[PDB]
Scaffold this active site. Structure first.
Site, mmCIF file in Angstrom:
data_model
loop_
_atom_site.group_PDB
_atom_site.id
_atom_site.type_symbol
_atom_site.label_atom_id
_atom_site.label_comp_id
_atom_site.label_asym_id
_atom_site.label_seq_id
_atom_site.Cartn_x
_atom_site.Cartn_y
_atom_site.Cartn_z
ATOM 1 N N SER A 160 -100.952 33.117 -16.608
ATOM 2 C CA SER A 160 -101.650 33.384 -17.879
ATOM 3 C C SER A 160 -100.719 34.035 -18.948
ATOM 4 O O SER A 160 -100.939 33.923 -20.152
ATOM 5 C CB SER A 160 -102.832 34.311 -17.577
ATOM 6 O OG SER A 160 -103.958 33.802 -16.882
ATOM 7 N N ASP A 209 -109.897 32.544 -24.644
ATOM 8 C CA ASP A 209 -109.775 33.585 -23.622
ATOM 9 C C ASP A 209 -110.944 34.586 -23.784
ATOM 10 O O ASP A 209 -112.018 34.191 -24.261
ATOM 11 C CB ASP A 209 -108.376 34.205 -23.841
ATOM 12 C CG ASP A 209 -107.717 34.780 -22.569
ATOM 13 O OD1 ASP A 209 -108.278 35.715 -21.997
ATOM 14 O OD2 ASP A 209 -106.637 34.310 -22.173
ATOM 15 N N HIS A 263 -107.408 40.844 -21.475
ATOM 16 C CA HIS A 263 -106.589 39.683 -21.196
ATOM 17 C C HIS A 263 -106.285 38.842 -22.453
ATOM 18 O O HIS A 263 -105.116 38.497 -22.698
ATOM 19 C CB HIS A 263 -107.318 38.899 -20.118
ATOM 20 C CG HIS A 263 -106.510 37.784 -19.532
ATOM 21 N ND1 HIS A 263 -106.630 36.498 -19.906
ATOM 22 C CD2 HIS A 263 -105.672 37.861 -18.438
ATOM 23 C CE1 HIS A 263 -105.948 35.774 -19.051
ATOM 24 N NE2 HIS A 263 -105.370 36.598 -18.186
ATOM 25 N N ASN A 288 -102.652 30.931 -10.224
ATOM 26 C CA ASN A 288 -101.957 31.986 -9.531
ATOM 27 C C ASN A 288 -102.181 32.006 -8.025
ATOM 28 O O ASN A 288 -101.973 33.049 -7.406
ATOM 29 C CB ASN A 288 -102.373 33.361 -10.038
ATOM 30 C CG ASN A 288 -102.012 33.605 -11.464
ATOM 31 O OD1 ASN A 288 -101.113 33.047 -12.083
ATOM 32 N ND2 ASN A 288 -102.773 34.533 -12.010
#
Ligand code: CA
Ligand code: CA
Length: 269
Positions: free
Chosen positions: A215, A32, A62, A153
């Protein structure tokens, strides 16, 4: 004082910690934006594959938030992850802007398999296939890594890559009513779902923040995988993946939910 986020309670991770299953001895790589040093996280190492950012520290937020759903420490502060004793590795494959090149994600996956990680969390995705990426998914899988990836998403009835690839375990997102979150991609190849709305976790600046996305659902499954591996240390990545699906709670449509909601209590029974 420590707070247990609703999602952690929803996948029943405290029932596993009451059995003595915390993720101990399981290595989990978070591919990430990095992981920032935080009082409720224990980062063991890592690597950066982003050229302008040689550090594994998180310029975005994130990766830190992801890392906290997997393994926020069980103590008197902050929150609690699913597998609070997992060995956390920060593999920065995306920059401070959330953007990342496929070559960066593919060497992240090769580092995971080369460094003996048991689970690799990829809370990222693309609508287009990639030869490079699929090869990297496959090589980490044949080196025993369980690759867990977000469905995406966009709300569409088909899921993103790498989650769509056969060797990646695809995770969708549910809400507090155990309905599909409206953004959660679904369709062919989806394996399981987990909490992905109003998910509180660790954030840069030694604080806590709420985020929504597939996520955030993915780390609940990466963590549940670490629980099953500590319980069953001889099991392979495929054994763990099938067990998590075999013990998931059905929520309806296999189209919308796959096997259903991950359940760490039933999985560590
Ligand atoms: Ca804590
Ligand atoms: Ca897949």
């Amino acid at each position: 004082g420590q707070s247990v986020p609703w999602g952690i309670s929803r996948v029943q991770a405290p029932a596993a910690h009451n059995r003595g299953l915390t993720g101990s001895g399981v290595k989990v790589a978070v591919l990430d934006t990095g992981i920032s040093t935080h009082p409720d996280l224990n980062i063991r190492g890592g690597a950066s594959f982003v050229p302008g950012e040689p550090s594994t520290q998180d310029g975005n937020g994130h990766g830190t938030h992801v890392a906290g759903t997997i393994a926020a420490l069980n103590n008197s502060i902050g929150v609690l992850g699913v597998a609070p004793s997992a060995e956390l590795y920060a593999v920065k494959v995306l920059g401070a802007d959330g953007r990342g090149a496929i070559s960066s994600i593919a060497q992240g996956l090769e580092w995971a398999g080369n460094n003996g990680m048991h689970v690799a969390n990829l809370s990222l995705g693309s609508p287009s296939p990639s030869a490079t990426l699929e090869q990297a998914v496959n090589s980490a899988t044949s080196r025993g890594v369980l690759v867990v990836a977000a469905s995406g998403n966009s709300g569409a009835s088909s899921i993103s890559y790498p989650a769509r690839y056969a060797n990646a375990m695809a995770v969708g997102a549910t809400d507090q009513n155990n309905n599909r979150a409206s953004f959660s991609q679904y369709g062919a190849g989806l394996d399981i779902v987990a909490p992905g709305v109003n998910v509180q976790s660790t954030y840069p600046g030694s604080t806590y923040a709420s985020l929504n996305g597939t996520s955030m659902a993915t780390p609940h499954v990466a963590g549940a995988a670490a629980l099953v591996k500590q319980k069953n240390p001889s099991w392979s990545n495929v054994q763990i993946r099938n067990h998590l699906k075999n013990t998931a709670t059905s929520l309806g449509s296999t189209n919308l939910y796959g096997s259903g909601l991950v359940n760490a209590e039933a999985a560590t029974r």
